[PDB]
Ligand SMILES: NC(=O)c1ccc[n+]([C@@H]2O[C@H](COP(=O)([O-])OP(=O)(O)OC[C@H]3O[C@@H](n4cnc5c(N)ncnc54)[C@H](OP(=O)(O)O)[C@@H]3O)[C@@H](O)[C@H]2O)c1
Ligand SMILES: NC(=O)c1ccc[n+]([C@@H]2O[C@H](COP(=O)([O-])OP(=O)(O)OC[C@H]3O[C@@H](n4cnc5c(N)ncnc54)[C@H](OP(=O)(O)O)[C@@H]3O)[C@@H](O)[C@H]2O)c1
């Protein structure tokens with residue numbers, strides 16, 4: 001007898017670049033499509049198609065996520081001066097992640113996948129650390145310019161209702177020039193950031209910490225601390241205490257030290273810049289960047305976008321281009337699919353898709369914990385200089401082993 | 415007679431660090447070194463009394479005598495302005511001093527062989543050179559109460575046309591906004607201090623910026639570092655088989671976590687403040703750290719104790735109860751300052767004493783004599799017993815004994 005495939009529903013797919021693009025196709029062909037039939041709204045976010053469409057494909061992909069609520073994104077190249085020369089781009093297009101995050105809005109939650117046999121670089125980290133980055137404002141919408149010489153730099157606020165213009169002196173340059181910057185953030189954006197952070201901490205049963213530098217920026221960072229405390233006392237304190245958890249504000253330099261010596265197991269709300277930086281530090285501390293997942297939680301509580309936290313792994317792609325053997329970890333990209341398929345299952349109440357999404361996550365961890373892993377995870381065990389070829393599998397061997405273990409697990413469940 | 419010390423500017427601190435500060439002088443320094451001490455009370459009550467005037471006066475004396483040693487002070491918050499009834503929420507005296515003097519704050523962990531590190535690969539130390547000027551620590555921030563236009567404007571001093579850039583058109587409510595700056599001469603000094611530190615240590619140098627987002631602001635740091643490197647330091651770097659490279663701050667924090675150490679990390683003001691606490695904690699203990707501000711003149715130095723004032727131990731001390739306060743950060747502030755003082759004066763005896771006090775401190779902990787916090791780093795706090803550590807006086811008395819023996823066998 002033949003087995004019918006799972007009806008998956010509508011998912012927005014965004015193809016990427018370089019080695020993650022190769023991994024992306026292997027995941028679809030071997031892990032998803034044999035078992036799930038999807039109404040796939042696919043958008044080619046490769047660097048060449050973004051140039052051909054003048055980055056309009058990035059625009060349409062973001063709007064498609066709005067309409068279908070679920071999106072899975074492959075890692076894409078952010079153009080710099082080297083990529084403009086390499087691909088002969090018309091202009092230096094903006095980062096597709098920044099464009100997508102601008103249209104959707106929300107908080108980017110990043111979390112490392114943990115395997116019991118993969119040692120971390122930070123010894124005490126047992127439970128995962130979930131960092132929630134406020135995906136709006138601060139340095140990423142700032143106006144910076146070069147000060148060419150001596151002169152007065154001021155920042156002013158002119159109320160829209162007419163009068164009461166206020167001028168703040170930044171610096172009076174007296175010897176030479178330099179640089180100056182102005183940046184901002186919005187009350188409504190910080191409020192949505194707070195709600196998603198308190199909701200995430202409650203759904204996991206973990207305490208929440210928000211990091212600012214309000215000792216120095218008493219008004220700018222004070223607004224973040226004030227809004228978080230206001231919403232916590234009014235709408236979340238009793239729920240936190242009922243779950244034996246808590247929320248506390250922390251100075252950023254105190255937060256990174258507390259996290260370094262902690263055991264993990266907490267939600268770490270971060271401002272835009274801090275979330276970008278500390279997430280890569282935390283990801284590397286757990287072992288490998290190929291194990292860090294990411295999901296954008298939009299303020300509507302209904303739209304999400306999952307993707308791997310790492311990039312396109314250009315160094316491995318070059319090896320792949322010259323025919324050399326590679327060992328690229330696909331776990332983060334796999335969990336981008338499972339997190340998106342799980343959310344699609346939740347919205348549609350698709351028990352079959354929900355069971356499948358979790359089974360693929362279990363197969364991935366069970367395979368590594370059974371001793372079958374890529375070179376990056378073997379280096380966590382033995383140290384890179386001591387890794388033998390027999391200690392790991394290449395990019396295609398690991399995908400094959402995952403595909404076989406997934407076929408076995410889904411057959412047993414039936 | 416005793417060792418001649420010379421002129422040293424001392425800044426007294428608050429609470430427990432102020433107690434240990436006095437203990438360090440009379441037990442470890444004064445019995446062996448005569449000092450021309452120019453004292454400045456940076457206590458929270460004296461700073462409120464003079465409206466923080468004693469802080470700028472202390473910085474000027476550091477400019478005059480070129481050596482400064484600073485105790486940990488209180489940075490007031492809302493609870494502190496109530497406990498002390500302060501006129502205002504005064505800012506950190508370190509930020510005031512760093513702004514007057516400028517330069518680079520070099521931070522490095524104080525390593526002990528028996529104190530376990532938290533990052534498995536950090537077998538070699540990491541030195542962070544934090545730019546001590548501008549950015550968020552000299553900024554102006556304010557609340558945007560509603561819809562309106564926030565603009566930044568540059569008016570040239572020579573009378574040429576001013577430029578106005580739009581920051582944001584607030585149209586859906588209020589929020590916050592801030593302006594911040596840095597100076598070319600200060601960044602050039604930041605570059606020179608970094609290249610010289612790497613050449614002195616024989617380690618590679620990395621600079622972290624976010625020039626993919628702040629193309630002009632952070633791009634100036636990258637461009638200035640690269641021009642000074644290619645024109646004045648590349649040949650010396652290649653002769654010692656070391657290199658300088660710019661790194662994205664995202665990539666660099668990951669590169670440092672999986673590295674083995676042994677490099678200089680030039681950071682902007684904010685990154686150096688945050689990352690140095692991460693690095694110091696990763697090497698074993700957050701308090702086991704040195705912090706020396708190197709001024710661009712090449713002769714002025716201010717060594718500070720970067721950890722807190724240990725308020726809980728101060729309350730225990732005020733109630734007459736025993737405490738176990740770690741004094742190593744305050745001790746190394748003295749030895750680092752005395753070492754630079756000996757270099758300026760060609761004082762071979764003072765230079766030997768400064769290195770001897772550092773070695774005694776490391777040897778004492780490695781021999782098993784240590785405060786309660788370091789014993790918790792080894793055994794774990796719930797497994798630490800009273801016999802596993804020494805109290806505040808006991809550890810300071812053990813250091814003084816071991817120091818006297820070491821200086822005796824030297825002669
Ligand atoms: N979400 C996104 O779209 C996104 C995010 C960041 C960067 N990028 C883009 O990706 C491109 C590459 O940037 P990058 O190389 O700096 O970042 P990256 O691709 O994360 O860096 C790859 C490096 O990190 C390690 N690594 C990362 N992912 C891995 C995996 N899945 N398996 C095994 N090892 C892994 C490897 O170290 P070894 O060298 O030791 O093997 C590899 O060289 C850039 O064009 C960048 O713009 C995209
Ligand atoms: N360099 C500076 O000038 C500087 C820097 C930061 C903060 N501060 C100021 O210092 C004040 C203290 O703030 P805080 O509450 O963060 O105090 P703290 O000094 O960080 O004390 C926090 C806790 O950590 C442990 N600890 C810290 N230092 C220790 C030491 N030397 N030996 C043993 N244990 C130690 C103690 O734990 P147990 O009680 O468990 O023993 C202590 O209760 C603040 O007012 C702040 O403004 C100054």
Ligand SMILES: [Ca+2]
Nearest residue numbers: 276277280664
């Ligand atoms: Ca990042």
Ligand SMILES: [Ca+2]
Nearest residue numbers: 253687688691
């Ligand atoms: Ca700090």
